[PDB]
Design a protein around this nucleic acid. Structure first.
Ligand code: ATP
Ligand code: ATP
Ligand code: ATP
Ligand code: ATP
Ligand code: ATP
Lengths: 362, 362, 362, 362, 362
DNA sequence: TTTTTTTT
């Protein structure tokens, strides 16, 4: 009649929960009967209803515990340990293979019985995106492969172009795809130390909107970024490890993650420019805005923001062999759903609408 | 029956594992039945497959205990305590001898060749590197003398040159073939005095670029570097037994570690001297880029970053007595393994190709 | 049947260890069966081999204990507490005996089984050092008892002299013998707050040359320092206690320490002169520098700044009566070495060599 | 058999010791056999020898304790509470009675059989100080009573005079007679805030060398202090509580304590002048200087600075009843002691001799 | 047997003590037998002699506890909890009624059998304050109502007049009567952030000496405060909640307290003029000056600053029904005491002769 | 004890 710390640790592992407060909160819900658990009846949250009946009996005794935070602490530690072990041992290809498996599990329930998504809407987003730039999907693949190999001195891509020209809109989807974080280099010289400290164990980073000093004749305000990146040239090249730091915790040391920069059409040092591998200079395209005006439901649902939209685009455009073996099994299934669910001229109609600037559906 | 904290502390000692999170993660892998273990079968990481057979019985009991992080702390303490003893009592030679042996062991896998690389790559590595500097081999040797003799005045070497000159990559490689840490000091020091616990218990530290107080008036970005160096002219001259402030990181009293100062072509007030072996020049020189461009495996496999790519240079030339008195058979074996495998006139291919600025493998 | 904490504390006292990782690491070395202990076989370190045989059985139980760092923390407190009892109750004369043991114990290493450096170079120092000043050894013993009696007003000697006159050099050797700190007063006034705050709690100090507004008559850089200096009478004469301070931190309130002033030959008021016991007018002088510029191995060993070479000089020159009575029984053992090893012609030759301006070793 | 924490608490109380480390160290000394205790034999510190025999039995078992520091921590907590109770509840006259009982204890040592200094030599100082200002002893009793009553506005005394007028000497002795702190207000308006925080919970403050304005018309260097004081009228007046601040801490509210001001002959605004209850000028006096020249032991033993000297003077001159009733019993025996140890003729002979400017003794 | 932690929790709740060392220190006093406790026999401190016999045995056991500070922390946190509860739940009228009860209790000691003050001197005090303004009691009654309603906009009062006019005297008395804190907005704009953190949870605040600018046309120094107050509009109007900040604590939110602004007769922006309900002008009145000269016990005993005198003014003047419902019983009884102690004739005679500036008492 | 506040 005592806490199975083991059963608690199973749940924290299986959910990948890594906040002690969230773990505590979630586990407590299992104290009441699953038998009439209205959340289970709603099938509302899988992280709840998948587990409640199994964990109920343990959670009933957990509710009486006087140690509760300590039990959750050791549970969370086990989840963090797995993250650390993986970060040292796995190849980046395998890390990314796992990241696909996570998102593909999420795409189960979104389209399952709960199913609250509409697959039509999400593919309108792909059609809008794929219309954005020539040969769109191939560019995503090239970024991902570069990110996988992590070729030293060849780690960063330049996105350039006017305000609202969609570079952030693209980038947000890429970041959700890989997992990673965003940071700002418009800050006072190398005073950014604890913000660059964010990048510990991250797979990818993205920097927003370098305020290129001197562009303001063209209404482009100046700022720190250009020369902060003139400074961080080792972080650009990645040819060395560095320290990074966070509070009431040890330092940590690693290669710095590869990433993306976004900027307006400020000038740039040709040398700093030569530290980037590649550019994408975005331009406004009115018909996409007119399309959006008539297609509000996308943004209400953040569809074009979402890495889930990119994944559907690759499942659409790419051969099955283009991805790691085990997920090819899943990718095959995700061909099947598209094959079944769309007539090809459905996508034609949709992308045809996008180009005509009508609402994507009609 | 009981968890044996002893058996855990053995594993920490033997792996030389040195973070509670890494250690905790590792040991929990053993809790599955060894006889079946897929990682043992797969032979993926020796830090597991060498040990799972032995520790499995104990890990079963470890997995149940309600205080797991405490065991890992005591075990990590033992590994760090071992390092702190040797941090005092060793001759400078035996420290460097320790550092070397592990590279030989890694080379045993690499070139006893259950590990992967083609030594031809790293011979080509030595070609690219050894071409960089007049008498580079002696430069490495002369550094090691200055290090192993801990020499006052001579305690620092000043790398002056443009960026992309390699000076930092060189310094970092000596942070491989020697232990040590990098450092930055270009700020008003008041609360920053707490940082150099990083330099406590170091044989060596490298001061990164002097972001000067004259600064961008030199076309080189500003900071507090030059004046801070001028101020701490006591410490650079080794005048002080280290009582710099901590940031949790605990105490080995020492003279401040020797090493390098680096400078992207900034100004210097002549007062800063009486305090080095010398200043040292560096330049980018296109043909070396021409070769690298034609040889970028040197960069992909990070050959040029490595201090492995300096160790191998030593083997190929020096009398074994210039190395440790004791280790001498190990180097003789590796000498033979490559003295057999090339004449100098073979990999003189690489030398003259690098000298010509042209690709360094066939 | 259990760890005796008592024996750990004895060892912690007898080592005078006061860092927890050091004590922990070392005491675990006693684990192995003492009879074969290879550190004992080699006689590596007495702090081991004088103890393992005694402590052995207890160290077995220690290694099996489940709270090791808690034992070590209490033992370290016992050692550091002893210092603070002594920090209260001891006279400056008894406190001076620390220096002598500190110096002699280090010197045992310096001429250890390693003969860590050839003691003959240290004696070649002792020779050259005595060459530098009229009645050099008496000039030291003058300063010694000057600093013992700490006599108010009668507290300070002015090291006057031109650039590169060895004043700082002798101060450095004196500061080696004695310890100290160095400070600057040419600073703007706001600095002195914390700058002088640095002087807090030290047995002796020096001031860097007072760059002073009139010296640039010579172009002696005309910092604020001399006008700044003649405000500070209460500190110098040590008549009355004074406040000191630290960044981010409180005042401290104490009698101001004694010590040394360097300067190059600015003008001064007799107002300032009266603060001093004494003045010394260094200059660079012929066969002293011109011997060293041959015998620069002593620059490389910095014996030219070695307070422990002053200690050998004292042991050579001075009556047994000149030293605190108990510790005379060590000094005799060093006298006996010097008598044999520097049989008189050895010493006489070395000094004579310097007196020929020619390499002190021949 | 258990440690008695109570005996440790009593020792911490009786020694009035409030550093956990100092307390710990001293209590350990008692574990060794009392009989042969060389500290006891040398009568080295009463804090030891007047206690070792009492505590020895408990100290031995305390030396076996596993938890030693917590015992000492609780003991220190006892003493700090006792201070804080007293600080909030005693009358000012009781606080001064405490200071006097304390000094009388130390004088029992100085002139006891241990005889650590000559009562002759200290009485030489009393004569010299009684000669420093007219009616010296009467002025001292006034000042003490003024601080004891602390009547609002009637709280501050002015010590104005040239350099080497001795005003610092008098202030030091008074501050030693009462306990208190010096302050500097030649700071700018920034630093004052933490400077005044020094005064927290003191009995006296002394303001040092307030540099006025325009003084170089009389060669006096000018500065902030006078103008700063005249803002602080409400701190001087002492009629309402003020907010006081320490670094890293919240503000505190209390009445600013009474005190003393020193300066050269600057002009004083009538506003500031009016807030002083007495002005006491000082003058240089040649016969004091020529007398003091020969009575060298006065400076070299710091007699004329010491509050022990002031306490002696009050005993020699004042009526018994003028003392608080508790110490009056001790005053009798000290008067009677001194009245044995000197005639009036002896004492008046010193005063006469000092007026002649000649070495004090014959 | 055991320590009753609950009896300590009573004693803290009883005494309202909320400092662990004051609580600790007092609780320890009781361990000696109250029967001979001289603090009891003296009845010197009510917080002792009321309680000693009651807590005797528990203190005797508490004196042997090994957990002493743990007991006290729990007790102290109980008292903090009560304040926190009341800080939310009470009305402003209850807070004022609570505050009045505290003062009445101290008055009953002061004028009790212990009688440590003379009610006639305190009544003499009341007369002088009545003469400071027209209709003084009506003014006080207006002020308190304005505070208790705390009506937005209508929250602040301005005191104005030349220096030595009584404004600070009245402010300090009103501040004692309600409780509150004083603040100095004349700082520069940065630390003013932390300055306002003092206002947290206060019933009331006072702004000192808000320095104008260009006041030197009126012989006044310029400053900063007024410009800062215009940057603080809504803090005064009390319409909206504000953020507040102490050192080393995360911010909190509340309506900023009502209060009083004080200045010498600078000019005011009409933007600032709009904040205030009312302003009161103070004129220097020499006959008060002459009265204080001849009535010194007023100042010396700090009568005229103390809120007790304002409460006496309220009791002697105001009709009973104006007081909060519960205390009307006590107030009636105190009026009855005052009518016993004085005829109106006597009070009228005091108020008369003050008007001619002769000393009060006759 | 850091981290924040102090420092700047
Ligand atoms: N190329 C485009 N043409 C027209 N409208 C666009 C384009 N790209 C994005 N939009 C619209 O502008 C909005 C903002 O786009 P986005 O933030 O990606 O632009 P941005 O140039 O990267 O801007 P910023 O630098 O401010 O982040 C989008 O949500 C979409 O509504
Ligand atoms: N001789 C060369 N000519 C041109 N490019 C070179 C040469 N040597 C190295 N490089 C390039 O410069 C890149 C950066 O080198 P590295 O950072 O070591 O230079 P550095 O001078 O030490 O720079 P910094 O001091 O600014 O960090 C290398 O990865 C390589 O691609
Ligand atoms: N008489 C001498 N014989 C040998 N070396 C000398 C002599 N005088 C000076 N030197 C050398 O001059 C160099 C500088 O000496 P040091 O720092 O003590 O001089 P300083 O006068 O204090 O310096 P500064 O020029 O800064 O005032 C040292 O190498 C010292 O050994
Ligand atoms: N009245 C005096 N007449 C002559 N010499 C004096 C007198 N008072 C002090 N001295 C000499 O001046 C020295 C300094 O004394 P002290 O610091 O007390 O003087 P001060 O005038 O108060 O100083 P400050 O200038 O620091 O205010 C004494 O040690 C003594 O040598
Ligand atoms: N009406 C008055 N007429 C003359 N003197 C007065 C008057 N009121 C107060 N005083 C005198 O002024 C002294 C100081 O009073 P108080 O501090 O309240 O003045 P203030 O003008 O408010 O000062 P500040 O503006 O400097 O804070 C009192 O102790 C008293 O001696």
């Amino acid at each position: 009649k005592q806490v199975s710390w083991k059963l608690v640790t199973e749940y924290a592992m299986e959910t990948k929960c890594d906040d002690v407060l969230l773990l505590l909160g979630m586990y407590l819900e299992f104290q009441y009967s699953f038998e009439m658990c209205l959340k289970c009846i709603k099938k509302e949250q899988p992280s709840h209803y998948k587990y409640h009946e199994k964990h109920y009996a343990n959670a009933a005794i957990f509710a009486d515990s006087k140690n509760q935070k300590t039990i959750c602490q050791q549970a969370v530690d086990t989840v963090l340990a797995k993250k650390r072990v993986d970060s040292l041992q796995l190849t980046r290809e395998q890390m990314l293979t796992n990241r696909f498996n996570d998102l593909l599990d999420r795409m189960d329930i979104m389209f399952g019985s709960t199913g609250s998504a509409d697959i039509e809407e999400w593919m309108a987003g792909v059609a809008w995106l794929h219309c954005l730039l020539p040969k769109m999907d191939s560019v995503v693949y090239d970024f991902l492969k570069c990110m996988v190999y992590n070729i030293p001195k060849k780690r960063y891509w330049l996105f350039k172009g006017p305000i609202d020209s969609g570079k952030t809109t693209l980038a947000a989807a890429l970041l959700e795809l890989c997992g990673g974080k965003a940071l700002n280099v418009n800050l006072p010289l190398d005073r950014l130390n604890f913000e660059l400290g964010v990048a510990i164990d991250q797979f990818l980073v993205v920097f927003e909107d370098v305020k290129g000093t001197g562009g303001e004749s063209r209404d482009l305000p100046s700022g720190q970024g250009i020369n902060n990146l003139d400074n961080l040239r080792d972080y650009l090249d990645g040819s060395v490890k560095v320290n990074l730091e966070k509070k009431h915790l040890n330092k940590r040391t690693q290669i710095f993650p590869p990433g993306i920069v976004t900027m307006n059409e400020y000038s740039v040092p040709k040398t700093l420019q030569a530290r980037f591998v590649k550019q994408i200079d975005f331009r406004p395209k009115d018909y996409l805005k007119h399309c959006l005006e008539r297609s509000e439901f996308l943004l209400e649902k953040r569809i074009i923001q979402s890495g889930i939209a990119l994944l559907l685009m690759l499942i659409w455009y790419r051969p099955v062999a283009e991805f790691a073996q085990s997920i090819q099994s899943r990718i095959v299934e995700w061909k099947e759903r598209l094959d079944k669910e769309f007539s090809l001229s459905v996508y034609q109609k949709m992308k045809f609408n996008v180009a005509m600037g009508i609402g994507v559906l009609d």
